[PDB]
Amino acid sequence: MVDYELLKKVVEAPGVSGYEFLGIRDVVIEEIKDYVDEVKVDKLGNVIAHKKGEGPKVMIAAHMDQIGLMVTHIEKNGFLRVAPIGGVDPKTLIAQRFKVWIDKGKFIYGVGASAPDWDQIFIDIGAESKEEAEDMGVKIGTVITWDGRLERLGKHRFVSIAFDDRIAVYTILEVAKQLKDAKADVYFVATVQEEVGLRGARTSAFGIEPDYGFAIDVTIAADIPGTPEHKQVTHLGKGTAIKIMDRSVICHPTIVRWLEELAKKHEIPYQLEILLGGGTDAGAIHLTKAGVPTGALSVPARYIHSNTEVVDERDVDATVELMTKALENIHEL
C-alpha cells in the first residue's frame, strides 16, 4: 500500500533537529522537485516546495527533523557523554546501537550504556582515550542517531526509527505526486526543528502567509496491553486521525467537521483525535500574523520517540487520500 523504497529513503536519512541538512534535506528536495514548480530552502533550513495554484494559498507541513543525541564531553578513557536533541527517554538508549555522525554521509558505530537518567548515560565507540576518540572524528557537538532500519511487521505494519515525523514527510511526497490541477496555491513544507519548539513551522508560515494551514504528524496509538480503553487515543489500522485538539492547538471546528465529511463522502477510514499533552507544527502555523485557520491529520503510531516506532500502511494511505481530497476541494471551503 505504500512505496516501501521511498519510505526507506526518508526514514534512514540522518537529520536531527538543527542538522537536517546532513541528509534528510537533500532526500526531500530530490524526491519532490519534479512534482512542483519551485523548491527553495529558507534561512533556518525549511524546504519549501511550491505547486502554483488556482485558489486559496495552503501550507501543508511535515517536520523533517528527528530526535537524537549530541556529544557534550569526551571522557579520559574515550567514552562519550551526551545531551538529548528533542524529547529522548534514557530508557530507550540502554543496550542500543547508534550511528555517530562524524561527517556528512559518514558514521561510526556506538553503544549506549548504563532506570537511568542522563548523568548515568554514556556511549562507547571503541576508543581507549579522548585523543583516540578525537582522531576517530568525534568532538563536542557531534550528533548521534539510533542505528535503526525500516522493516515489515506482519501484513500491514512496519517498524522504524523516526516515523515521527518521517512518515509525514513520506505522506506529503505522495500527496505532491498525486495532486493534479488543484484549485489552490500549494506550499509543501518540510519544516526544521519541530522537536525542540515548532521553530521551523513558525518562520516558514510567516514567510508564506497562507490562507489555510495543515500539518501532518504522528499521534499516539496506545492500543497496547495494559492500557485502559479510554486512554488508547487512536488505533492502528482504523484510519487517518483528524485532530480536534492537542496542547498546542484547537483545530478550527469548521475545518475539523469539513475533513470528517470529506472522509465520509470518499469512504476514507478515519478516527477523531484528542491529546491531553502533545505538540504539532499546527500549533505555530495557526498563530502566524493575524491568524490562520488550520487542521491536522495524523498517522497513528505506537512506541513514539524510540528506535522502534510502529505504523499501519492502511492509516498512511488514508492520510494521503484525505489530504489529497482536501486540497482538491478546499476552494469550496
Residue pair 185/58 in contact by the 8 Å Cβ criterion: yes
Of 84, 76, 62, residue with least CA distance to 164: 62
Alpha helices in 136-232 (DSSP H): 163-178, 199-208
Task: Pick the closest to residue 145 from 316, 278, 20, 298 (CA basis).
Answer: 20
Please check if 164 is assigned to a binding site.
yes
Minimum distance of ligand [As] from residue 201's CB (angstroms)? 12
Q: Where is 232: in which H helix or E strand?
A: none
Contact residue for Zn ion among 12, 20, 165, 309 (CB under 5 A): 165
Q: Tell me: does residue 217 bind Zn ion (CB under 5 A).
A: yes
| Beta carbon of residue 88, minimum distance to Zn ion (angstroms, whole number) | 10
Contacts of 120 (CB under 8 A, 6+ apart): 90, 114
43's contact among a copy of itself, Zn ion, ligand [As], none, with CB below 5 to 8 A by partner kind, is a copy of itself
Question: What CA–CA distances, in Å, run from 15 to 7, 20, 65, 253, 333?
Answer: 15, 4, 5, 34, 36
Residue 294, sorted as left (phi over 0), alpha (psi -120 to 50) or beta, turns out to be: beta
- Considering beta carbons, is residue 115 or 180 the nearer one to a copy of itself? 115
CA angle 251, 255, 257 (to 5 degrees): 100
Name the site residues for ligand [As] (rule: CB under 6 A).
Answer: 164, 217, 279
Per the CB < 8 A criterion, the answer to whether 61 and 215 are in contact is yes
23 binds, among a copy of itself, ligand [As], Zn ion, none (CB under 5 to 8 A by kind): none
Nearer to ligand [As], 251 or 330 (CB): 251
CA 11 – CA 149 distance, rounded (Å): 8
Residue 288 Cβ vs a copy of itself, minimum distance, rounded to whole Å: 8
Annotated binding-site residue? 235: no
Nearest distance from C-beta of residue 238 to ligand [As], angstroms:
20
Tell whether residue 217 is among the known ligand binding residues. yes
Tracing cell 495543515 back to the chain, one arrives at 214
| Grid coordinates belonging to 223 | 492500543
Grid cell digits, residue 208: 508564506
* 196 interface partner picked from ligand [As], Zn ion, a copy of itself, none, CB below 5 to 8 A per type: a copy of itself
Q: Nearest-CB residue to Zn ion? A: 165
By beta-carbon proximity to Zn ion, the closer residue of 164 and 321 is 164
| Pick from 189, 162, 161: nearest CA to 173 | 189
Complex with Zn ion: residue 288 or 298, whichever CB lies closer: 298
Q: What is the DSSP letter of 150?
A: -
* Residues catalogued as catalytic: 194
- Residue placing its CB nearer to Zn ion in the complex, 86 or 110: 86
223 is in an annotated binding site: no
185 binds, among a copy of itself, ligand [As], Zn ion, none (CB under 5 to 8 A by kind): none
In whole angstroms, what is the distance from residue 110 CA to residue 308 CA?
A: 18
Shortest Cβ 265–a copy of itself spacing (Å): 18
305 is in an annotated binding site: yes
Specify the residue, 198 or 318, whose C-beta has the smaller distance to ligand [As]: 198
Cβ at position 170, least distance to ligand [As] in Å: 16
Q: Which residue has the cell 525500516?
A: 150
Q: Rule CB under 5 A: choose which of 12, 20, 65, 164 binds Zn ion.
A: 164
Per the annotation, binding residues are 63, 164, 195, 217, 305
Question: Which residues are near Zn ion by CB under 5 A?
Answer: 164-165, 217
Per the annotation, binding residues for Zn(2+) are 63, 164, 195, 217, 305
